[PDB]
Amino acid sequence: VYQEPTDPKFPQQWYLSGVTQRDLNVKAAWAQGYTGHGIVVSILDDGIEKNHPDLAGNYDPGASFDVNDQDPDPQPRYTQMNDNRHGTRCAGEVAAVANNGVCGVGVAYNARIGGVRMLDGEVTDAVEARSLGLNPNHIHIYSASWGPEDDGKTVDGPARLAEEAFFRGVSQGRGGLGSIFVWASGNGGREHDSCNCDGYTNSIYTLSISSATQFGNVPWYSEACSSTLATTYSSGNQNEKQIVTTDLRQKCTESHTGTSASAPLAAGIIALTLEANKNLTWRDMQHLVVQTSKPAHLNANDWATNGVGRKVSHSYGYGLLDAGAMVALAQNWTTVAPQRKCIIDILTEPKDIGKRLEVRKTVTACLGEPNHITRLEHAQARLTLSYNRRGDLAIHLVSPMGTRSTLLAARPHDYSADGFNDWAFMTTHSWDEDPSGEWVLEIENTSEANNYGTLTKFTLVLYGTASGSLVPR
Amino acid sequence: KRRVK
């Protein structure tokens, strides 16, 4: 019989287990025997307190480096304001030591944990690339609780070196099975930001994770978009509990908050899943998340059922992660077929946007060719357009099975006249659908102003396979 | 700044 941890703050970790069903079902995975042994996770942030009494026993120097100062020791820089506490708080969520009389426990409390010190300085393209590409045959899972500014007017993503690091990681990392990249979807809720305008979360190579409050609501800081995959608990209002973890100066905190706390919990659950089947590819892991995540009792006004019967929301993706279900399904999982890519250039001529523009196109999805796709994974609409006030635009894409993805919602603070330059808006909401048939793109002006512009390119890019499907939910 | 926590 499994004995649950005895750490002094474990009873306050409401999100790991309980009788109330408002949890991530992590104790069920522990009782199946999975605690993270043999898995390596690295936190890409402002450093890690490698001598913390709740981290030292799991610390891994092979998973660590200091990119800011060009040395191997990722110890954070100590200041009166404790500004460099952020990475230590994230690490304890993943792999804080269990049954040692100190603070609480990590989701994967027997995993090995490291940190890359890379945010305490100017964060260039080269700095990102060196961190994402660190020791890729030793580190299994990378966790990133940072990104472009959440001011609600930025459009930005990885530059050339960083994008090259993503492709090298999923292609050759982890013995050719592919590095696992976990991303926090963002804190821009108060600015009405869209996480499709962030190239890191919007990438197909990252699992982008959103947040829910203890009572099951959309937190004030949450950003909605179609590229989010799933959700873990984090903070909310002052009557709702928060996240318990290791803090700077060898302390314990019960007040870790925001999008920053959601990605590390997902990284820990993925660590338990890899222990249950070390042969899973980067794409296998996203399939497992899609099939096992749970919508129930998360409140949102946009829940919709897609073409294969799964509920999906722009605030939550496919719902809350379920650790017990993840490790169970992983054990006898059959590896997916190699990934196919079908490129469809839609437009024959430019189109004026004006007040509203609708573009309809029936596709065969590369029928008769080696890259024929009958079973979709990610889909992208790569758009080039000019417009006089970018934040007045709303953009939607409808799949042949009738699933309406919001690619872009209105952004009141985005006054840019720069438009979009081949920006690859991504949706997860049509996963496992057949993409043959009519696709519909809608672009509209959400304001009463007399705005003007032109759509000059629309490439529909489909990813997936032609085998292995399941009876729709 | 280019990147934020």
Ligand SMILES: *C(=O)CCN1CCN(CCC(*)=O)CC1
């Ligand atoms: C965490 O990154 C460490 C504290 N500090 C925050 C702001 N600083 C840049 C300030 C702008 O020049 C980077 C590091």
Ligand SMILES: [Ca+2]
């Ligand atoms: Ca150092």
Ligand SMILES: [Ca+2]
């Ligand atoms: Ca502990």
Ligand SMILES: [Ca+2]
């Ligand atoms: Ca954002």
Ligand SMILES: [Cl-]
């Ligand atoms: Cl590609």
Ligand code: NA
């Ligand atoms: Na490979």
Ligand code: NA
């Ligand atoms: Na992503």
Ligand code: NA
């Ligand atoms: Na069809």
